């Protein structure tokens, strides 16, 4: 009745998974059909997206350094993730990761949602940092649920569209 | 409205926080009222007592070895968390944390229980096996509300006192 199997190796896992720690997928969840979600993201990457978890969420940057984009009491911030830091990050707060570096690994820690508690994926303009577009998500597969709601925001100049200055968000990348 | 602070470095906190990972404390909460339960424990210590955790546990044997006792599948059992070891305990599986060295540390994370969902702490008998003493309790302080739980067993011959082949349980050590 060990459902996730038995201790093993962290640094060796990590190492094993290198390949997967890069683009394009990025990242690598732990063990599956676990109530804590269990992440290693690596990189480079970058986006343009905030997140909305409706849960808390863990960091502990294991190896290199990232950063977190953050609106923080209604500006614009930035939360280091230096190799060796650990970070709570409380419910709702809006968070862009970009993670500049190769080679560089995160642990990051999350909850399953409820039936019926969402997560909102978020985009602001550079302009007037007004709210461009949000999409909400019953998430639960994200390396497959996410991609393709990405996708769709990239796609459409309308969604792209600030309300407020006529700025149209650069997409993919800032 | 980063309610739990900045990230900072935790080889340091743990290294700073190294008188509080020994006798009689034991272990360190790094946040205080987050829904993720984040403690680390140092050693050594020795316990008698299983845990049923209505939810899962995580660790990561950052410093030093421990092993956990087990009940897995109706036998007795020990998952070793030797350093650098991460693991994930499904709810409800008893355990028994053993952690025999000195300056060892090891990450461990959990969720607060809602109102309503109890954690049990039981003793086995040496002897035959059975279920000796087991107390429930809302656990909203376990720092405050399991030593005065686990003095009572100690305390009792009654409680100690196996049920099926009256052998008296020694208590506090083995
Ligand atoms: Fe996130
Ligand atoms: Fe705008
Ligand atoms: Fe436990
Ligand atoms: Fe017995």
Redesign the interface.
């Known amino acids: 009745?060990?459902?996730?199997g038995?201790?093993?190796?962290?640094?060796?896992?990590i190492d094993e998974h290198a390949h997967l720690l890069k683009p394009p997928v990025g990242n690598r969840q732990?063990?599956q059909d676990?109530?804590?979600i269990?992440t290693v993201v690596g990189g480079p990457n970058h986006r343009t997206d905030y997140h909305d978890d409706p849960?808390?969420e863990?960091?502990?940057?294991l190896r290199g350094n990232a950063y977190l984009n953050?609106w923080?009491?209604g500006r614009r911030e930035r939360?280091?993730?230096?190799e060796?830091?650990?970070?709570?990050?409380?419910?709702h707060?809006r968070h862009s990761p970009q993670r500049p570096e190769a080679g560089s690994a995160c642990?990051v820690?999350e909850?399953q949602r409820p039936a019926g508690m969402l997560d909102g994926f978020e985009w602001y303009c550079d302009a007037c940092g007004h709210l461009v577009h949000r999409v909400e998500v019953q998430l639960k597969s994200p390396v497959t649920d996410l991609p393709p709601l990405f996708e769709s925001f990239y796609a459409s100049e309308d969604k792209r569209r600030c309300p407020h200055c006529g700025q149209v968000h650069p997409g993919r990348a800032a």
């Open positions: 009745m060990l459902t996730y038995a201790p093993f190796n962290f640094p060796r896992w732990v063990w676990s109530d804590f269990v849960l808390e863990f960091f502990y940057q953050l923080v009491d939360a280091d993730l230096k060796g830091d650990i970070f709570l990050l409380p419910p707060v642990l820690i909850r």
